[PDB]
Every structure is written in C-alpha cells, then in structure tokens.
Design a protein around this ligand. Structure first.
Ligand SMILES: CC(=O)N[C@H]1[C@H](O[C@@H]2[C@@H](O)[C@H](O)O[C@H](CO)[C@@H]2O)O[C@H](CO)[C@@H](O)[C@@H]1O[C@@H]1O[C@H](CO)[C@H](O)[C@H](O[C@]2(C(=O)O)C[C@H](O)[C@@H](NC(C)=O)[C@H]([C@H](O)[C@H](O)CO)O2)[C@H]1O
Ligand SMILES: *[C@@H]1O[C@H](CO)[C@@H](O[C@@H]2O[C@H](CO)[C@@H](O[C@@H]3O[C@H](CO)[C@@H](O)[C@H](O)[C@@H]3O)[C@H](O)[C@H]2NC(C)=O)[C@H](O)[C@H]1NC(C)=O
Ligand SMILES: *[C@@H]1O[C@H](CO)[C@@H](O[C@@H]2O[C@H](CO)[C@@H](O[C@@H]3O[C@H](CO)[C@@H](O)[C@H](O)[C@@H]3O)[C@H](O)[C@H]2NC(C)=O)[C@H](O)[C@H]1NC(C)=O
Ligand SMILES: *[C@@H]1O[C@H](CO)[C@@H](O[C@@H]2O[C@H](CO)[C@@H](O[C@@H]3O[C@H](CO)[C@@H](O)[C@H](O)[C@@H]3O)[C@H](O)[C@H]2NC(C)=O)[C@H](O)[C@H]1NC(C)=O
Ligand SMILES: *[C@@H]1O[C@H](CO)[C@@H](O[C@@H]2O[C@H](CO)[C@@H](O)[C@H](O)[C@H]2NC(C)=O)[C@H](O)[C@H]1NC(C)=O
Ligand code: NAG
Ligand code: NAG
Ligand code: NAG
Ligand code: NAG
Ligand code: NAG
Ligand code: NAG
Lengths: 322, 169, 324, 169, 323, 172
C-alpha cells in the first residue's frame, strides 16, 4: 500500500499530574497551579504604609508612657499594628484601661499621629507633682511612674479641689487619657490626698463621667495592693474637656493628635520587619495576591486570596499524556 | 482517543492537534493551526475566568475579644469556619469538574478533526481503524494540503480511486 | 435531471444578543435570558402589605419622648420598618441621652400594634409643680416648652416631698415606659429647681432594680444648656408593676406606649419619598423585584431579596449560536 | 441549500433543527418537531433549575452598632463581604459553565439528526460533505417525508440506486 | 429476513429509583445513592465519648447556687455539653439575678473537671448567725430553706460586726466562687436583719475590685418576697486569694467549684431522654450520623456535623437509565 | 433483540455495557468487562469525591444572647441563613449537573463500543439503525467473539459478504 494521512495529537515528556472528578493522577502535557502556597517570612508595608511595631510594649504601656517603654513615634502613620507574644512593658501599676479592645481597634490604622503637651505640671501650683511615684513602675530600678500622665499628691497636708479645662485648638481629634487611683485603706487615703471621700468629674460635649475610689483589700500585683483604672476619650476640635476632682486623680499631661481614615486589626507575630511591600500580610509572612486561593494563614490583613484547607489546586491546561 | 487513536506524537511539537502524512515525496508532521489556536484561546480563557472572576476586598482578621466576650468570639469562629468550608469544597470540586471537561474538550477536538478528513475523502480512501486513512489514488503534497486545508478535490480522483478499489477486491 | 437533495441545518435569525462561556467570550446567540435584577423603582413602598413608619425630621428618641419641635401625627399603629434620615434635624432639644438606644431602635423596627396611652396624669402630683418643668432649649411657638410625653417635676412652695408612686400594667399588652434624670450644673441650680441638695431616683419592677444619682458638674454648652437629661426605658409586662421613688431631678413618665411585637426588622436611612407601592424587597434607593436569584442594586436590603452580587450581567444562552 | 457544515439557515424559522428538501418539484424547509421540542424542554428546565432552586428568606440589613461597637460592626462587614464574594464567584462561573454546555448541547442535536438520516438512506444517496445528501434515485415530496418522518423504504429504490451508482463514472 | 446479527446494548433492571438532571426531571435509573442525611435516633447521646450534663428541671444558676429543689448530689465530674430545658422550673428561688449569666453558661458548657469543695465552713462566723437565713421563697420539704452553697448571714445579739475574711486558693486548679448581696425592703427590715443602716460589700482579688451597696427601695413581690438577691462570681486562679469585707447584706460563699476547662461548647435546650449512646453530631431532636456531607434534620447541632440544607433529597445517579 | 438506540437489555445482568449476538448456534448476551469496570471506577470516584472533599469541624450552635442583645442575635441569624442558602443552592445544582454528566457518560461509552464494531465490519455487515449489525456472511460463535475482541478478519469473509451483498441490493 501507500499514501496515508493520519490524525494525531501532541505529547511531551511532562510528568505533571492533575486530578479529575472521575479519575485520579491523570498525567497531562501542561498544568497550572491556582493555589498560593508560599510566604516570604517577613512583615512588610501594607499598600505602601509601614506597620507600627511595638517591640516590647503593649498599647496601654506605650500610650500612657511606661518609663521603660522606648516610645519611638518616628512613624507618624501606620497601616496596622504588630504586637509580640509577651510585652514586658504593660500597665506597670496594676489596674485596667477602659474599652481597651475598642481603643486598640481604633489605633490599628492611624493616618496621622502626634503627641502634644496639653497640661504642663505648672498647672498644679497647690498640689505635689513630683511625688507621684511607685516601685511597680521602675525606671532604672528607681521608683517612677507613667510619663504621659501625672499622679497628683497633697501639698502642705491639703488637697484643694481641682477645676481645670482644656479646649481643643488643634484642628484634629485629640486622644486624652486619665485615671483614678484606688487606695488601700483609710489612712493611706488621707496620707496621699488628705480627703477621706473623693471624686473625679470628667465632662465634655458627649461625656458625663463621675468616678469614686473603691477602698478595699486586694491581692498584691507587681508588689502593690492599690489599683489604677485609666479612661480615654476622643476630644473633637473646638470642644472642651472639664475636669473636677479633690483626690485620687491621675491627671493628663500629654495627649495625642489623631486623624483616622480607615480600620485595621492588631497582628500578633514575632517575625522581623523586612523593608518590603505587599497587599496581603500574615503573621508568618507576606503572600502574593494574584492567585484566587491560598492556604498559608487565616489571620490575614489586606486584599487576600480566599483561605482554603487544600494542599493542591492544579488545573489541567494541556492534553492527556501517556 | 475515543477508542480510536492510540495517540501520542512526540514528533508533533508545533501544535496540539494536526496530521501526519506519507507518500512518494516523503513523510512528515503538520499541525492543524486552526484547531490548536481555538483550543489554546479557549483553554486560556477558562484559566483566566477561574482566576479573574474572583472578587477580593480589603479585610483585617484578628483576635480582638476579651475573656468575657467568648460568645462573640465563638460567633466569629463559626463565621470563619463556614467560609473556610464553602471555599475549600467549591474550589476542590470546581477543579475536578473543569479538569474533566478540559480533557474531554481535547478529545472532542481530535475526533472532529478526524471526521472532517473522513468527510472529505469518503470512498477515495480507506479507514484503517487507528486514525489513519489510506488513499486509493496518488496524493502528492499539494493534494495532502487540500485535505489539511479542508478543500480536498473529490471529483478529481474519484475515477482513479474507483479503479484501484476493484483492482484489489 | 439534477440530483435531488436533503439537507440538515439549524435556526439562525438577526439577533445580536451575546453571552459568555467558560472558553469563549463575546458569543452571539439567537436568544438569551438575563437572571440579574438591575433596576429599582426609586420609591419607598410597603413591605408585605404593611406601610413603613417614616420619621421626616425627627429621630426615634425625639419621636418617643415627644420633642415639641417634631411635627407629629401618631397615625401609624403598625409598621414593617422605620425610615430615618442620616442626620435627623430634631432629636433631643434638651441635651442628653437615651439608654440602650440602639437596642430600643431594633425593638421598634417592626411593631404589630402601637398605641400611646396616658398612665400618670399631671393630677397625680398635688405637691409638685407640673407646669414649670420647661426649657428654652425646647421651644414651642416661641414659648419655652419640654418633651410632651414626660413631665419635669419642680418643687412647690420651696419643697420637693419624696415621691413614692407605683403603676400596674392592667392592660393586656406590653407597656413601653420612659423616664429620665436631670443632671444639674451647680448647687444653686440644684436647690432652685428641687430644694434638695442630694437626690436620687429609685425605679423598680419584677426585673429591674435601678438607682440614679445626679452628676452635678461643669459641662460644655449643648443647644445653649450645660445641663443634661439622661432617659431610660423598660418594657412592663402585663400585670406587673413599676415602682418610682425620688426626691428631686426626676423626669417622671406621663404617657406610655401599648406595644405588641411579633417580627423583627431594622432601621433604614433613606431620603427617597413614599410612593404608595408594595414590594417584597426594599432598598434605600428604591424597591426591587425578587423574581431573579441575583441583584446588584444595593446591599442594605429589607425583605425577601435576591442574593447581592458584584456583577453587571448574568445572561444564560437559551438559543443556538448565530451568525447575523 | 448549505447544510450544517456551512452555518445556520435564516430561512428555517419554525424550529431549532430541521431539513431542507430540494427535488424537481421545488425547494422548501422543514423543521423536526421532536428534537426541537425535546431540546426546548431541556434548556427551559436548565433556566428554571438555576432560578427555582434558590432559597430566599426574610432578612433585614442595616447598620445598628454605635461608635464603641466597631469590632462587632467589623464582624458584620466580614460576613456580608464574604457572602458577596461567594455569590458573585459562583453566579458568574455557573453562567459561564452552563452557557458552554447549552451551546454544546445544540451541536450534539444537529449531528444526531444528520446521523439519523445517514443511517436511513445508507448507499441510496451520496454524502456531499456540507451536511446534505444527494439521492441516487428520484425522491419526490412523499419520498422526502419518508426520510423526515422515519419511514424511508430502502429496498424500494435499492436497485435503481445501484444502477446509478455503478454506471456513474 | 434476519441473518446473523451482533448488537450493542446496556444494562437494565427492575429498579424504580428516580434522579433529576439539570435538563430532565424524574429520570428512572438502575442504581442511585442519596447523600442527604435525614434520620435521627431520637435520643441524647454522648458527644465523642463524653456524657452530657443533663439538668432535669433546674437551670445553671439554680444548680450552681444549690437551689434546694435541685439535686445537690449531682456528680458528673466532666461533660461535653449541658442540656437545659426550655423553661427550667428551678431558677433562683429567691428573686434576683446572677451577674454575667450568659458568659458563665458558655464557660461551663464543656468542662474537663468539676468538683464542689468546702472553702468557708459555717463555723467561720462566730459573731454572726448562720442558721437563720431561710426563706419561704426557697422551700424544702415544704418548709423554708435557702441556697445550699451560700450562707445568709444575720446579726447576732443585735450586732453585725464587720466581716474581714480571705480565702487563698491552695488547690492546683481554678476555683469558681459565688457570693451575693441582699437588697432589703425598708429601714426597719434592714435593721432587723443586719442592725447596720448603711452597709457595703467589698470583694478583692488580684484582678477583682468590687464594691456593692444595697438598694433599699419598695418593690413588688416575686415568689412572695419583696427583697432581691444579686449574685456574682469570679474565677480564683491558684495561689491567688479572694478578700471579703462587709458589714451587712452579705450572702457569703460556703462551697466553691474546682474547675478545669479545655474547650468550648454550648447549652442545648431539649427535653429528649438520655440514651446511653454515642455520636459525633447531636441535635435537639436526636443524634445523627456524620458520614454524609449534608443533612436536613436540625440547625442547632453540636459536634462535627454535615452542612445543614433546606432540601428533601440529594440523590446521585450511580447507574444507567432504565426504561 | 434490538440495541441501545431502542433501550436497555434486561438480559444483560453481568455488566453495564455489552453485546447480544444471534447466529445459527443460537443467541446470547456478552458484556464488555473493560469498559464496564472502568466506568464503574469513574462513577465510584465521582460519588466519593462529592462526599470526601467536604471539610467538617466541631461547631457548637446555640442561642446564648439575652433580650438586650437582639442585634447580635440577628447577626447570628443572618449568618446561619446565609450559609444555609449557599449550601442548599450549591448542593441542589451540583447534583443536577453531575447527574446529567453521568448519564451522558454512559451514552458515550455505548457509542464507542458501537463505533469499534462498525470499523471492523466495514461493508461485510449492514447497519440496522437500532444498534445492531446484520452480517452479509455467516458469523459463527468464534466469528462473533472475534468481533467482541479486536480480531475480526475482514478479508476472510469479504468474498462471501460481497456475493450476498449484491443479491440483497438487486432484490433477489
Ligand atoms: C514607706 C515604706 O516603704 N513602708 C514599708 C514598711 O516599712 C517599715 C518601716 O517604715 C519601719 O520603720 O520598719 C518596718 C520594719 O519591718 C518596715 O520596714 O514595711 C511595710 C511592711 O511590708 C511595707 O508594706 C511598707 O512599704 C510600703 O507599703 C505601702 C502600703 O502599705 C505601699 O505598698 C508602698 O509602695 C509604694 C510604691 O512604691 O508603689 C510607695 C510609694 O512611695 C507610694 N507612692 C505614693 C505617691 O504615695 C505608693 C502608694 O502609697 C501606693 O501605691 C498607694 O496604693 O506605694 C510600700 O513602699
Ligand atoms: C476652642 O478653640 C477653638 C479654636 O480656636 C475656638 O474656635 C474659635 O473660637 C473663636 C472665638 O473663641 C471664633 O471666633 C472667630 O473669630 C474671627 C475674628 O473675629 C471672626 O471672623 C469669626 O466670626 C469668629 O467670631 C472662631 O470662629 C472659632 N473657630 C472655629 C473653627 O470654630 C473655640 O471657640 C474655643 N472654645 C472656647 C470655649 O473658647
Ligand atoms: C396588677 O393587677 C392585677 C390585676 O388586678 C393583679 O393580679 C390579680 O391578683 C389577684 C390577687 O393576687 C388575683 O386574685 C386571685 O385570683 C385567683 C383566681 O385566679 C383566686 O384563686 C384568688 O382567691 C385571688 O382572688 C387576680 O386573679 C389577679 N388577676 C390577674 C389578671 O392576674 C396583680 O397582682 C397586680 N400586680 C401587682 C404587682 O400588684
Ligand atoms: C479473540 O477472538 C478470537 C476469535 O474467536 C479468539 O480466537 C479463537 O478462539 C477460539 C476459542 O478458543 C478457538 O477455537 C478453538 O480452537 C481449538 C484449537 O483447534 C479447539 O480445541 C476448539 O475446539 C476451538 O475450535 C479459535 O481457534 C481461535 N482462533 C484463532 C486463535 O485464530 C481469541 O482467543 C480471542 N482472544 C481473546 C484474548 O479473547
Ligand atoms: C497562698 O498560699 C501559697 C502557699 O502557702 C503562697 O505561695 C507561697 O508564697 C510564699 C511567700 O509568701 C513563697 O515563699 C512560697 O514559695 C509560695 N509557695 C507556693 C507553693 O507558691 C501564696 O502566696 C498565697 N497567696 C496569697 C497570700 O495571696
Ligand atoms: C498520585 O501520586 C502521588 C505521588 O505521585 C501519590 O502519593 C498518590 O497516592 C497517587 N494517587 C493515587 C490515587 O494513587
Ligand atoms: C511572590 O511573588 C514574587 C514575585 O512577584 C516571588 O518572588 C515570590 O516567590 C512569591 N511568593 C512569596 C513572597 O511568598
Ligand atoms: C467584547 O469583549 C471586549 C473585551 O475587551 C469588550 O471590550 C467588548 O465590549 C465586548 N463586546 C461588546 C459588544 O460589549
Ligand atoms: C419589576 O417588574 C415590573 C413589572 O414587570 C417592571 O415594571 C419593573 O421595572 C421591574 N423592576 C423594578 C421595580 O425594579
Ligand atoms: C410518513 O411519510 C410517508 C411518506 O410520505 C407517508 O406515507 C406517511 O403517511 C407518513 N406518516 C406520518 C405519520 O406522517
Ligand atoms: C447510623 O449508621 C449506622 C451504621 O453505621 C446505622 O446502623 C444507624 O441506624 C444510623 N443511624 C441513623 C440515626 O441514621
């Protein structure tokens, strides 16, 4: 015989395998993975903005000014916040910070951040401004206190009633923090503030707060049975905050100019910063956003692929191979 | 492919589908550029569509609930796990389904290519049962092109092919 | 003489309608069907036959407490959802707050029966002034006034005797009762209005045990007043009694609301006008049909609605491939 | 006069699939009622199934969280955006995949109708390669209907076709 | 006419099973497989080998505080989920509340180890009356009684000396501690019980700083009593101490619960009986099998369960068309 | 006995696809083992994939929100109903699509068996259009087996087939 013509198709040396609905491990000439499976192992900028990385400080210890915290604010803007596992510098004096979780959520992404002085220590001429010191807040083994806030004490066995106001003339929102000290017993209350029964009144256009100390026996924390409960408010421009107290007042000294344009979350990770940029950040490292799926980590920040519980998503694009 | 062609041409490297010929002038491979380009364009669209159609927006996932908000945290946990299951199940099954259709798509193209050649030749050639046709006349390289081009001239060779048929059986 | 022929063919017409496939984009077909809802009538309609409660210039808190600057009708005994504006003009003429406001708004979003009734008439206070509880921050027709559903009790003859009153919900339905406390500015204003320097309010039901004390302090001026009035609410179940006790700063209830609730809804922020229509799916920009399984109009829907998608087109090819 | 190999028939407007007879008595079009109606009932079920299988219930979507409830508001955002991504992705791919099936479903119906007639005529006619058969015998309008309605009598014309098959050179 | 023939065909049988396709409805096939779970055993079973805690007609609050209408010999040291009833008949017998109730119920839904222990015996109050705190609101055998796990202290010899007591958690596990405050009706009742017109309760641990004052006001009768009792709780971590100080209206702790938690669960509201069975998925109407990927039984499941769908049948064709 | 175009065979009780022959030695059924077993494997894998690829974890679903947490309860309601609609729609459509795929899968296998036979017989047999071939020659049981496997010898019977093909077409 002779003069034949035949119909055939392409084959190559490819060993790539894909899975189908009816058959398993079908070798094909070409394939394509649609699953992101790798991370670079560093924290990067998120859409061109560096994160705020508190090395050994919590948000509360950083905001209130723990004397051990190195509160570098060289970054006036951040896209998210990185906290480590066990921040040594937390609220050194035992107590709490009201609405802490909502406060951390608010500070997660901040467009503009500047610490300013709103009430200097000169504003308290009839109270002691330098004895507000405790061993639970050491500086160099020496008793100290939070730097952004002032613990006022009686002078000349007297604590005259405080009535001060501050008006926001800064054209930006102001984050103001203050606190109340809960003393341990009656004698300690008079040894510090000379007034057995005391109060704190805080008033803004939206805030009407009254605080009274709770004298009670408590367990020692950081060597002290006393407690300090801290509070915060966002002072809008042209609005004023009014303070009135006759004891147990942890008066503000520094505040923070705040401009917030968007929301983020706090990321807990021990990885290092790496001077990179990404659209999707994970606690173990940044990932690319091109693929539609990934399996790296569920705690992502950014525009990310859908997280799936899969180790392989390979699309067959070539012919069957044998 | 469809119980018809054993399949697999390592020699064919310039296209997905096409032909092989053999005559007095010699032999060689020739890819069908039309079917290959339509298949390549079609498959490329499928991969892009599976990727492009996904909508992604900015989200921040953290653990922002204290020890007295466990009911809220469990609500978030149920939401995250529910979306984890929806995407994992859908993605796994879509890949399995589309991989099946893509491979069936390749088989459909080769079968149609065989049918177009068979539709042209008719009784001028003999089907060998393995995807090859044996001509009943002399088909030169110009004749082979017309088959590949889909414009084979049946009346030209019908009389000569009929004579060669009866000179065999 | 020519050979007879029979042929196999398919339909073609002059249709230009196009669909997409997984492998081919921009394919012309003879006929196709859309499954995406893309239109809205641009009106506010009834939801399942029930007209919404539309507050024009008043917020829910002002509407409930009876803000005198809120032009009221109280014609609606039932509604399916509440339409508010993003920035209601009249909310609280005297600055203050309504406790658990968001939960209360959720409670009132869908009401089966609503009827204001008088539970404590002003005759019930023979030893307290009931006509002086009036402010310039709550004007009515150029005259100082106050919230119309509560009474601001004032001392009489330089005396504010202790109030010990009780009301039993003898109606067949739940009762929504509101009350408040007035936060003074200084000691002088405290004794001017009430004559009692240290005051309290005791509120008690079978489920509620509340004690309020005024916070007399210096505050910023809001609506021309440095004082505040914080309001509270409770739902008095039938045959239960609420107990009030106060020696000053008491904003006593006068009118309560007979309320029956079966379903739940939410509050819609929209400025679009009512259109005397009916629908099963309402959006802040207008009502949409629910025939198709998908829509792209708006995410803030109320009713039985298609699934919201970020797509502009979902056409199913029903006819054959076409070459016009 | 073309067949399915060339393209569609603008002339045939009474069905999806049909015939076009051309004998000495004139020309005309016919529509296969059975395969058109069977195919029509098919895509109608597919459209209804895509629409009717959707389950809908009453829901109230609003923003009901204050300024100190941003974490809970963020949970609602992630939930709503998550269902937006799921529905958008599935709806578009479902339309893409089902449109491909619907168009392929039409190609199969056309080929099956051609193969049905091919089996009926056998060698009584000639395969022209464009989707048309040319008869080796006189086929009148009643003869055309026998092909269309499945009652073509092959032995009636078997000897007439064989003489025309043999004598044609 | 017919000669030698060879034919091509396929299997058919007598099956009447029907499946549906995207283009056809009610298609009969030779074999089919349903992937929808539709059956439950109508019993409350163990969840992954751990028995549930079934409170017969009591609530978590009444069970914890020791309502005398609740079985106090309930000795389930470990459970995977708690089964309350729709409306338990034995809540706090004396009217009042339990603070942070819902979070407490979630915390106790699954417990690895649970043991009641005596931390402050009734002999620890030599200058107060410990056996006079009974009420008709909390009857036992018809006559007045009180919550078994807490002590209602009363004045002794027309005197209520100030209480200053602390308990240090010397155990190796967390302690769940409950206490309460009594809101009296009027001044005369306040003096009859506690002799002190102005009273307070202060509770202090490493993380707890509480000060409670009675709200003396007129209230309507609930369970025949116009007073109220508000109960609070804390988790006392090991080696941490709790400090109490009060001069009246103090409902002191007597028994606490050593607690170990290693996972979260939920409270199921059901009246179905226990069945001495086991399951990986429990529903309020019964246990279901978790092999199939979908089920249509009940949405309030606990465990590893198939996805809940609103469907009657999901049957796959695994055979050929029948005719 | 007709073929696949008409319907299934109740006599085929040993496989999914197969053959029926009829010669002078009698009739009988014979199933194609290879295409039946491979089809059974494919359907088995498809069913197992739909079941095994589902991921399930521990979830405790309850109602732990009081009368002043109705907004959060509504959020839980919206999530649960949303997941219900997603799974219900996907499960119904997936079953409908895969059922159509399975029945089309059976049709292709039958046609492939038919086309393998038609290639061997060529003009030695006539297609009846019901799924059966009538031999233009005598085909005994050994000949029938040669068609069932791929060893049918066309030139052996061509002379006999040709003689009988012309008699039928001439009307003899
Ligand atoms: C002043 C002092 O250190 N007292 C010390 C006491 O010392 C006596 C000593 O005076 C006497 O002469 O001889 C005794 C021989 O045993 C004995 O050494 O000993 C007792 C017993 O342990 C100590 O508790 C006590 O130490 C002070 O105790 C305070 C409570 O009673 C409190 O804990 C003090 O710590 C500080 C702190 O560092 O935080 C001290 C700060 O100056 C003070 N700051 C201010 C602004 O007042 C601070 C404050 O009191 C509390 O934080 C309020 O809650 O407490 C601790 O030194
Ligand atoms: C808190 O500080 C802010 C920031 O300065 C004050 O807002 C400003 O207040 C002044 C008067 O106190 C307003 O006066 C304006 O002055 C010019 C010059 O005469 C005139 O053109 C205007 O008509 C006007 O009177 C000024 O508008 C205002 N600025 C803004 C942006 O509101 C605020 O008053 C301070 N609060 C208190 C209680 O003092
Ligand atoms: C608020 O008012 C209602 C209605 O007046 C009070 O409920 C009523 O209480 C009385 C006495 O407790 C009940 O009378 C008793 O009824 C039964 C028959 O059911 C009978 O056995 C007794 O001898 C006795 O007469 C009356 O039925 C009951 N009515 C209703 C409708 O409940 C209620 O107590 C008041 N609330 C408060 C807090 O005072
Ligand atoms: C493929 O089909 C062919 C065609 O039937 C099979 O070959 C034939 O098998 C039969 C049955 O065994 C053989 O007939 C027997 O031969 C012996 C030897 O004379 C005799 O003892 C028996 O009475 C009977 O006639 C037949 O000769 C043989 N033909 C050949 C080999 O050309 C073949 O076995 C089939 N292959 C498979 C793998 O099933
Ligand atoms: C509760 O008691 C334990 C055990 O007695 C106390 O822990 C001991 O504390 C002393 C100092 O007071 C240390 O020297 C011991 O090493 C500790 N022992 C253990 C086993 O931890 C604990 O401080 C007490 N808690 C209080 C007083 O709040
Ligand atoms: C597919 O191949 C991989 C390794 O190449 C193997 O682990 C896996 O088991 C194979 N699958 C089957 C179904 O045999
Ligand atoms: C992301 O993409 C880059 C290049 O765009 C590549 O080098 C890297 O391996 C990818 N994966 C990561 C960072 O996980
Ligand atoms: C065809 O697809 C292209 C893709 O670039 C698009 O621009 C165009 O609008 C489509 N055709 C029509 C008629 O819209
Ligand atoms: C709903 O359907 C009506 C009646 O067919 C139509 O007029 C309207 O445009 C559709 N769309 C709406 C109201 O969004
Ligand atoms: C089928 O066509 C033949 C030939 O024209 C005609 O005799 C017969 O009546 C037709 N049958 C039907 C049912 O139309
Ligand atoms: C669960 O499956 C077992 C077999 O594994 C069966 O005996 C039992 O009846 C099933 N129970 C239910 C409730 O479906």
């Amino acid at each position: 015989p002779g003069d034949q013509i035949c119909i055939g198709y392409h084959a190559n040396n490819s060993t790539e395998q894909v899975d189908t609905i009816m058959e398993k491990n079908v070798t094909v000439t070409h394939a394509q993975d649609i699953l992101e499976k790798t991370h670079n192992g560093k924290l990067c900028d998120l859409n061109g903005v560096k994160p705020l990385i508190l090395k050994d400080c919590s948000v509360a210890g950083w905001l209130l000014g723990n004397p051990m915290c190195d509160e570098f604010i060289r970054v006036p803007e951040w896209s998210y916040i990185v906290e480590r596992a066990n921040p040594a510098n937390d609220l050194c004096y035992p107590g709490s910070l009201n609405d802490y979780e909502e406060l951390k959520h608010l500070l997660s992404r901040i467009n503009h951040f500047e610490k300013i002085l709103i009430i200097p220590k000169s504003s308290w001429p009839n109270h002691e401004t330098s004895l507000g010191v405790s061993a639970a807040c050491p500086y160099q083994g020496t008793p100290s206190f939070f730097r952004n806030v002032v613990w006022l004490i009686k002078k000349n066995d007297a604590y005259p009633t405080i009535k001060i106001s501050y008006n926001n003339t800064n054209r930006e929102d102001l984050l103001i923090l203050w606190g109340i000290h809960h003393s341990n017993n009656a004698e300690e209350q008079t040894n510090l503030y000379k007034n057995p029964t005391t109060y704190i009144s805080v008033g803004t256009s939206t805030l009407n707060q009254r605080l009274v100390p709770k004298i009670a026996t408590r367990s020692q924390v950081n060597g002290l049975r006393g407690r300090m409960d801290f509070f915060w408010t966002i002072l809008k421009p042209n609005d004023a905050i009014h303070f009135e107290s006759n004891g147990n007042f942890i008066a503000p000294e520094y505040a923070y100019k705040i401009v917030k344009k968007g929301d983020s979350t706090i990321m807990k990770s021990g990885v290092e910063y790496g001077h990179c940029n990404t659209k999707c950040q994970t606690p173990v490292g940044a990932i690319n956003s091109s693929m539609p799926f990934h399996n790296i980590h569920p705690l992502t920040i950014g525009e990310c692929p859908k997280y799936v519980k899969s180790n392989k998503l390979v699309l067959a694009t070539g012919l069957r191979n044998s | 492919i469809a119980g018809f062609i054993e399949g697999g041409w390592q020699g064919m490297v310039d296209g997905w589908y096409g032909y092989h010929h053999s005559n007095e002038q010699g032999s060689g491979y020739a890819a069908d550029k039309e079917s290959t380009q339509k298949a390549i364009d079609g498959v490329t669209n499928k991969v892009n569509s599976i990727i492009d159609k996904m909508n992604t927006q900015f989200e921040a996932v953290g653990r922002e609930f204290n020890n007295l908000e466990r009911r809220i945290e469990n609500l978030n946990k149920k939401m995250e796990d529910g979306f984890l299951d929806v995407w994992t199940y859908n993605a796994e099954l879509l890949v399995l389904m589309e991989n099946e259709r893509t491979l069936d798509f390749h088989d459909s193209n080769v079968k149609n290519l065989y049918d177009k050649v068979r539709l042209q030749l008719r009784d001028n050639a003999k089907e060998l049962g393995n995807g090859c046709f044996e001509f009943y006349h002399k088909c030169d390289n110009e004749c082979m092109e017309s088959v590949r081009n889909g414009t084979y001239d049946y009346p030209q060779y019908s009389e000569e092919a009929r004579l060669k048929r009866e000179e065999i059986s």
